[PDB]
From Swiss-Prot:
It is an enzyme of class 3 (hydrolase). Completely inhibited by phenylmethylsulfony fluoride (PMSF) and partially inhibited by benzamidine hydrochloride, leupeptin, and pepstatin A. Its EC number is 3.4.21.62. Ca(2+) 2 binds at A169, Y171, V174. The active site is at D32 (charge relay system), H64 (charge relay system), S221 (charge relay system). Binds 2 calcium ions per subunit. The gene is apr. The lineage of its organism: Bacteria, Bacillati, Bacillota, Bacilli, Bacillales. Optimum pH is 9.0. This is Subtilisin BPN'.
Length: 275
């Protein structure tokens, strides 16, 4: 029994699936706590680990990386769920440990491994409250090298009239993603600010969990992978397009929801975006 998560339908991915665009050959690096490659519903092409104590990227001792990955590429078969890009080449770049945290050096190292290894799209469902020249260095270089870089905007909510979008999501070169529910309302925890680009489903997102399980989670970490997936579908239909063009498309065919400070350019529509 294969269940199609609401979010995958909400961003109109199945329309592209029916046409034959499912992300084939598009490499997507999931920079997270690793991905359980043994999960029947995910096919992991490769990766690397930068957590000195957890050298196996195919071992997810946290569960977060696996869930994010499921939303990106859960296989289209007879079981579990269905990712936004079920045919994408899933790369596990493990930079976060068992408890969920990592050092910036580990994270940066992973971003750099992805650039070095020709990733097409990088997904970062993580953010820090403070930045660094080396972090900005890493993301700016990825984009300059053709990579589409996507990141969760953060779960800080609202604070006066100030931005709560964390890094690397804050940098202009990075696609900052907010979380909306099934009724398109902004999640109360979703970070706000002028750096917000788009919104995607982020509440009660059903996905893959370590040890052949499935569970729902809420957070902008669940939102970012939908847009990361969206990029893969667009790239599968238009392999010749640059990351700039892909981004433009995602941002210019959205469904406006409210003020950009809280919803960015709005909810993404991959059917419109893929042209
Ligand atoms: Ca499945
Ligand atoms: Ca940004």
């Amino acid at each position: 029994a294969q269940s199609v998560p609401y979010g995958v339908s909400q961003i109109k991915a199945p329309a592209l699936h029916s046409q034959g665009y499912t992300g084939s050959n598009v490499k997507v690096a999931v920079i997270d706590s690793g991905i359980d490659s043994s999960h029947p519903d995910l096919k992991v092409a490769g990766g690397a680990s930068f957590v000195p104590s957890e050298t196996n990227p195919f071992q997810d001792n946290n569960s977060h990386g696996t869930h994010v990955a499921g939303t990106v590429a859960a296989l289209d078969n007879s079981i579990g769920v269905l990712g936004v890009a079920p045919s994408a080449s899933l790369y596990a770049v493990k930079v976060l440990g068992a408890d969920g945290s990592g050092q910036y050096s580990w994270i940066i190292n992973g971003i750099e491994w992805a650039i070095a290894n020709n990733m097409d799209v990088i997904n970062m469902s993580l953010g820090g409250p403070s930045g660094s020249a080396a972090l900005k260095a890493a993301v700016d270089k990825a984009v300059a090298s053709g990579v589409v870089v996507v990141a969760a905007a953060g779960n800080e909510g609202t604070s006066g009239s100030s931005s709560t979008v964390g890094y690397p999501a804050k940098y202009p070169s990075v696609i900052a993603v907010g979380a909306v529910d099934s009724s398109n309302q902004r999640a109360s925890f979703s970070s706000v600010g002028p750096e917000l680009d788009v919104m995607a489903p982020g509440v009660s997102i059903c996905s893959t969990l370590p040890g052949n399980k499935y569970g729902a989670y809420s957070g902008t970490s669940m939102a970012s992978p939908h847009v990361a997936g969206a990029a893969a579908l667009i790239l599968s239909k238009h392999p010749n397009w640059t990351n700039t063009q892909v981004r433009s498309s995602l941002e210019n065919t959205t469904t406006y929801l409210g003020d950009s400070f809280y919803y960015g350019k709005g909810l993404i529509n991959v059917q419109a975006a893929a042209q």
